[PDB]
């Protein structure tokens, strides 16, 4: 209220506006001011809730960046810090896996 800004130790994204069957999600982070490309990994761990129920055991950020993509393409982080989470065996297939 007073206009003070404080950093969040724990920050969550509310996926409440999304009402569709989702194949996968993609997660990035970037500087608020530099609204440009070249993404950064600032995530130590992440977990997923549906109606306040855990969906899986909290995993480290490296899991989401390096491991999870195996399901689909570009499981690498040479300059990329793009992490994903899938709800399907593959993301790329046209078929609604």
């Amino acid at each position: 209220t007073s206009g003070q800004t404080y950093n969040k130790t724990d920050v969550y994204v509310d996926m409440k506006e999304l009402n569709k069957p989702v194949k996968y999600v993609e997660i990035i982070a970037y500087e608020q001011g530099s609204t440009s490309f070249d993404y950064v990994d600032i995530i130590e761990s992440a977990t997923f809730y549906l109606n306040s129920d855990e969906q899986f055991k909290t995993r480290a950020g490296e899991y989401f960046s390096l491991v999870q993509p195996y399901q689909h393409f570009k499981r690498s982080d040479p300059t990329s810090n793009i992490s994903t989470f899938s709800f399907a065996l593959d993301a790329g297939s046209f078929q609604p896996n």
Binding site: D90, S93, Q95
Partner: protein
Amino acid sequence: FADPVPDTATAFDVVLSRFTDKKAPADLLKGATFPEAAPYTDSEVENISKLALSRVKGPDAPVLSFISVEYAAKGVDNKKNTHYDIAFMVYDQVKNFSLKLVLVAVLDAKNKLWIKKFSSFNSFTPKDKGPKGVENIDETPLAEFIPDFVQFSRLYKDNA
């Protein structure tokens, strides 16, 4: 009493069926519907499976040795018709393996045993499951060309 082996069945299940009671007991046990179940009795079920195995003495019958019972479902109606639905493991001492058998059997008031079903746990021999399955996920089978009225192949057949 009991059921004929399904027209489609393995040889193992046809033999197990050959040893069921297809004839009614006195065909008097029609008097009440469904059992009441409140038993906490265990060892009694082991003896019913053993008795069903004691019924198999055919010249072509496998050697069957009792292992153990699970899902010992019992209850009795008020005409003293005791219903059992028993799942148990049996060891084949000649070919070296174990299977689960399903035993559905009843006792009369005199504790004589009749077997309604004796079969392998697994069923649906034909494997007609709705889902067919795909060898590749990222393969979209090419869409059938829907032909004009005549379906092509009939068109060349009609045209000499």
